[PDB]
Design a protein around this ligand. Structure first.
Ligand SMILES: CC(C)(COP(=O)(O)OP(=O)(O)OC[C@H]1O[C@@H](n2cnc3c(N)ncnc32)[C@H](O)[C@@H]1OP(=O)(O)O)[C@@H](O)C(=O)NCCC(=O)NCCS
Ligand SMILES: CC(C)(COP(=O)(O)OP(=O)(O)OC[C@H]1O[C@@H](n2cnc3c(N)ncnc32)[C@H](O)[C@@H]1OP(=O)(O)O)[C@@H](O)C(=O)NCCC(=O)NCCS
Lengths: 268, 265
């Protein structure tokens, strides 16, 4: 009844994960079933399937409880400024909303973590340095971001039993979409540096809610559901977890088209 | 919000001092709302104790393979090379001990000793010494990290944790001169470059009391008697009722406690 490193690797190959792939994972680890090495079995199986030339990624974000204290400008009151732990890509935890897997991947030796805290990705493998280098601090889900690099490299996204609305790459589609009324987030962020804490205003399209008004919180799940119903992507079990594997470029373009058909003015 | 500074003040108020080697057993949920989660506790401990001190915790490890028993403690041959081997840098801390040992283990600079079931994690001035050369047999006895904590005059902090989780009292069980001590043997897999390598580990069993006739949680009674004798300190760390005891004192108290009942003075 134990799911092993070998058995999960076989499930991953059966679903379409291939040697050399760059694979970003969204997991609901409890749905995989009985795991012999806990969540680390999932990470190992992904690395076994993808080989030393591939890369395993996950969405990290970070635990910034201090955001409950910021004013309407997104700035930290002076009374709290020196009590807020600054972001350090090597020490700051992955956000707890994203599950156990991003944090377990972050603390796997060799894993790198990009520099934009809220948009940070973790990467482990051959192109981890490229994925995590020079993450732009403003609009960190757009051009030059790890998500943009995942599309460029022909990477893939694996929903390992996770709800389909957690597909972070669709925030990149939100950034690219040519639509009016895009919601913007501004937040002050402290960065750990060799000379001490540096504070910096971060501006981006807001990813805590849909990019524009008139959308349900989980409307990403609808985009993926329509994507799968249209015959794109792959479906199958990884352990006990029903899973979907999609092409990063395909789901991004589908998401942009989806948004621009509904709120934009598309071509034909 | 409870902050790094306020928790460090609570720790100093309770008796944690500059340069101390402090071993922590925590129930993080009782400390209250923390601005940097459990890492605030680790930071406050290092701030209170300073660069000359050391922060420690009991790591153990998740050896779910132990559920594939055989009563002599051996892994069936079909599983011997599917069992995840112990790697001191990569194996997780056991989850029975709470989130704090694992958060401390993955703090950069933290080291972890080589006896998997008895493994301690240490961060600070003497972390390399504390975690070095952990004997594979009787890893709660002489030359162990727990013995080194006693030797260094360290302290143990029960940070809202149930008092029976005080791992150092297993060292008192090892030291106690008493008959009928129960012994555990188990096969343990170690990760090596050429594949998994095995070690038969022998130790006094720490899953149950050292001898028969004791309550499962009798460590908590020992700590209560220790405090009732006027030793150690109690107080709040954040919202967490806490106990701070001297490692050498509680060990000697524990040895005497066991030797009054089953041994001889
Ligand atoms: C929210 C969500 C994570 C909840 O799913 P979940 O499986 O219940 O939570 P996790 O993924 O962290 O899995 C936890 C499992 O891993 C194990 N686990 C967790 N921490 C562990 C630890 N320190 N040691 C050993 N095992 C551990 C546990 O066995 C646990 O299973 P259990 O509670 O049944 O015993 C999931 O629905 C999801 O959304 N995943 C994608 C997250 C994401 O990418 N979000 C992006 C922002 S929208
Ligand atoms: C079993 C025991 C750990 C349960 O106490 P607990 O406080 O409920 O569990 P933890 O210590 O791991 O604290 C978890 C808290 O830290 C936070 N936390 C846990 N994981 C987190 C994560 N990835 N990110 C951010 N915060 C996290 C949570 O806020 C959680 O509190 P909540 O779930 O109530 O909201 C405790 O009773 C105990 O025995 N501690 C001593 C253990 C020991 O040393 N045993 C020795 C062997 S006998």
């Amino acid at each position: 009844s134990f799911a092993t490193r070998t058995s999960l690797a076989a499930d991953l190959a059966a679903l379409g994960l291939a040697w050399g792939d760059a694979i970003m994972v969204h997991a609901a680890v409890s749905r995989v079933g009985r795991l012999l090495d806990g969540p680390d079995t999932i990470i190992a199986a992904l690395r076994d399937t993808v080989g030393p030339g591939g890369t395993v990624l996950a969405y990290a974000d970070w635990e910034a409880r201090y955001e409950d204290l910021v004013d309407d400008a997104g700035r930290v009151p002076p009374e709290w400024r020196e009590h807020v732990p600054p972001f350090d890509p090597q020490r700051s935890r992955a956000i707890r909303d994203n599950g156990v897997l991003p944090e377990f991947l972050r603390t796997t030796p060799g894993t790198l973590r990009s520099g934009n805290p809220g948009a940070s990705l973790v990467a482990l493998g051959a192109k981890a340095e490229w994925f995590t280098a020079d993450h732009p601090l403003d609009y960190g889900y757009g051009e030059g971001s790890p998500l943009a690099k995942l599309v460029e490299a022909g990477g893939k996204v694996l929903m390992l039993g996770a709800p389909l609305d957690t597909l972070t790459l669709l925030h990149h589609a939100e950034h690219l979409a040519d639509i009016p009324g895009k919601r913007i987030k501004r937040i002050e962020v402290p960065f750990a540096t060799p000379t001490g804490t540096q504070w910096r205003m971060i501006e981006e399209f807001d990813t805590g809610d849909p990019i524009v008004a008139g959308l349900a919180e989980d409307y990403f799940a609808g985009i993926v559901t329509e994507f799968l119903a249209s015959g794109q992507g792959r479906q199958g079990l990884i352990g006990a977890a029903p899973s979907v594997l999609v092409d990063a470029a395909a789901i991004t373009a589908f998401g942009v088209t989806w948004l621009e058909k509904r709120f934009g003015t598309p071509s034909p």
